[PDB]
Design a protein around this ligand. Structure first.
Ligand SMILES: *[C@@H]1O[C@H](CO)[C@@H](O[C@@H]2O[C@H](CO)[C@@H](O[C@@H]3O[C@H](CO)[C@@H](O)[C@H](O)[C@@H]3O)[C@H](O)[C@H]2NC(C)=O)[C@H](O)[C@H]1NC(C)=O
Ligand SMILES: *[C@@H]1O[C@H](CO)[C@@H](O[C@@H]2O[C@H](CO)[C@@H](O)[C@H](O)[C@H]2NC(C)=O)[C@H](O)[C@H]1NC(C)=O
Ligand SMILES: [Cu+2]
Ligand SMILES: [Cu+2]
Ligand SMILES: [Cu+2]
Ligand SMILES: [Cu+2]
Length: 533
């Protein structure tokens, strides 16, 4: 299909890298004595230029940048972020991949209007993994993310750093935030408002950059891949600019929840919205040349339904250098980690069906906005449940995300005989792609925190209208751990707070180090994430 967005001079701009995020301070957690990093993220409108000739894009991002700044949080240390809505429409932040407490996870109605803020308290207790934070405000999540509200966040671990993979953000450890958008003639974004099926977009970006280049060295590299698009799934492969139809093969080191048990040797990476895979690519043998990362056309090989455009088969270009400026000491081992799969159950799976009821995308025929029927499962905490995710349709694809949890992919059956379980789905994830006529079952231990959590399709057009539901992690009244105050995401105690706007830049009022400090220490005392120890 012919491109709508103006013509772009491609592979002409070097790959941008989002800066890391700095905490404002630390606060002493009175329970254990440890400290707590505290960030302050403002959400403001800003204007950015993509088409080097004319026109700027009207955005709204985390700190006035899309993608928002990146978080490298060492495991163990609890972290806390204040999100300050200085924008034009409500917001609700989700840190995709953290088993936070219900009121810190980005419940779609737990929202912050402009002229207010809200503090999120994150445990940072899980395994090394790559996470991202995005808006989750009800029914406007597509457009809030489309315009810039998303970013990186890495739960790191020095133990696995003792594997000497290509290390170091920005040089051997590079982020790949894939989006797919569309622009006006004048240069501005075209709104996702009014789309009821999918917004594919005809312009491909990495780190907010349409069709860019990166010069590299003939050595192993770590690439972190994230499909942050609204509706587009990707089918990625590498090919030498001179046999563009030949797939260069690579190694997939980690999925959404972290490393797989063994590097998945592959040559084509199926990746849908919100999925994360980490790839290492030996640029060893391609010295001198110029490798191109491409996107599988034909609606991702008949897995999906995406509309392809003139230039949505190209993602970006890699220029290998003539020589390594210093040799490749980095390494990729063959055993990677022990993966804590959940102790298998044998029970019959719970069934969730993802379709539309007339014009509305539903799960088992209910729409998120339907408060009565929104809750579709009660799972007592500590339960393991297999869940069967069913896309019976031929004209829609559905990457299904479940909050709090990390699950193992048990099975996929494709009505189109298209595929079975893929080799990089052997570890742990929190998002699975239901392709055309696909049914998947996943297994996950529902632990360790009670609370009311979301699950939904991560096609933001679908999610917004209205393919999203809720499950309740249940305990008995004798449980404890203060759970009585962390199960309701709308708990009036963790809600947003108005702020006098100029007191934010003066660090007065609620932002004085002591108010900042009293509040966090107040917060810490509740021992929120203590059930994980
Ligand atoms: C999700 O599940 C949680 C439990 O994990 C539910 O919280 C529970 O809500 C019930 C209300 O039906 C509470 O029981 C009642 O509390 C009142 C107040 O003391 C008491 O007078 C009654 O005799 C009865 O015990 C229960 O304590 C509470 N449990 C916890 C741990 O908070 C929650 O309602 C569920 N959410 C949804 C949306 O259904
Ligand atoms: C449940 O929540 C309370 C609220 O913070 C936890 O902490 C104590 O709360 C009392 C007031 O209820 C304060 O006077 C104490 O100062 C708090 N403790 C500390 C060390 O400051 C309480 O510990 C929590 N219980 C569990 C089991 O997590
Ligand atoms: Cu998400
Ligand atoms: Cu999520
Ligand atoms: Cu969907
Ligand atoms: Cu979600």
């Amino acid at each position: 299909v012919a491109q709508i967005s103006p013509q772009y001079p491609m592979f002409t701009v070097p790959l941008p890298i989002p800066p890391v995020k700095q905490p404002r301070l630390t606060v002493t957690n009175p329970v254990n004595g440890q400290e707590i990093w505290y960030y302050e993220v403002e959400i403001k409108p800003f204007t950015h230029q993509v088409y080097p000739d004319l026109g700027s894009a009207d955005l709204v991002g985390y700190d006035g940048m899309s993608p928002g700044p990146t978080f490298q949080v060492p495991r163990g240390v609890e972290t806390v972020v204040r999100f300050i809505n200085n924008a034009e429409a409500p917001n609700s932040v989700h840190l995709h991949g953290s088993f936070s407490r219900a009121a810190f996870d980005g419940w779609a109605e737990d929202i912050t209007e402009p002229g207010s803020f809200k503090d999120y308290y994150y445990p940072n207790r899980q395994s090394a993994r790559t996470l991202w934070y995005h808006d989750h405000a009800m029914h406007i999540t597509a457009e809030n993310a489309y315009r810039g509200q998303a970013g990186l966040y890495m739960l790191t671990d020095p133990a696995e750093d003792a594997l000497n993979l290509p290390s170091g953000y920005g040089e051997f450890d590079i982020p790949m935030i894939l989006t797919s958008k569309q622009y006006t003639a004048n240069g501005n974004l075209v709104t996702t408002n009014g789309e009821l099926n999918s917004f594919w977009g005809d312009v491909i970006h990495v780190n907010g950059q349409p069709w860019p280049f990166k010069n590299v060295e003939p050595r192993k590299y770590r690439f972190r891949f994230l499909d942050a698009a609204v509706s587009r799934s990707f089918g990625l492969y590498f090919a030498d600019t001179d046999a563009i139809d030949t797939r260069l093969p690579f190694k997939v080191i980690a999925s959404d929840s972290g490393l797989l048990e063994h590097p998945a040797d592959t040559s084509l990476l199926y990746i849908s919205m919100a999925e994360r895979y980490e790839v290492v690519f030996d640029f060893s043998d391609y010295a001198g040349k110029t490798i191109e990362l491409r996107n599988l056309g034909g609606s991702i090989g008949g897995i999906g339904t995406d509309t392809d455009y003139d230039n949505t088969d190209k993602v970006m270009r890699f220029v290998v250098a003539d020589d390594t400026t210093q040799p490749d000491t980095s390494v990729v081992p063959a055993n990677l980690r022990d993966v804590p799969f959940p102790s298998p159950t044998t029970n019959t799976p719970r069934q969730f069906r993802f379709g539309r009821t007339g014009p509305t995308w539903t799960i088992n025929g209910v729409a998120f906005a339907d408060v009565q029927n929104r809750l579709l499962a009660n799972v007592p905490v500590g339960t393991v449940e297999r869940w069967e995710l069913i896309n019976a349709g031929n004209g829609w694809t559905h990457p299904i995300h479940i909050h709090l949890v990390d699950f193992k992919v048990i099975s996929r059956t494709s009505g189109n005989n298209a595929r079975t379980v893929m080799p990089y789905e052997s570890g742990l994830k929190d998002v699975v792609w239901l392709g055309r006529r696909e049914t998947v079952v996943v297994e996950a231990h529902y632990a360790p925190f009670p609370g009311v959590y979301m699950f939904h399709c991560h096609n933001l057009i679908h999610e917004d209208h209205d393919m999203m539901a809720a499950f309740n992690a249940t305990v008995l009244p004798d449980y404890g751990y203060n759970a009585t105050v962390f199960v309701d995401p709308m708990e009036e105690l963790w809600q947003a707070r108005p702020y006098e706007l100029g007191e934010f830049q003066a660090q007065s009022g609620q932002f004085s180090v002591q108010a900042v400090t009293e509040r966090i220490q107040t917060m810490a005392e509740y021992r929120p994430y203590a059930a994980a120890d």
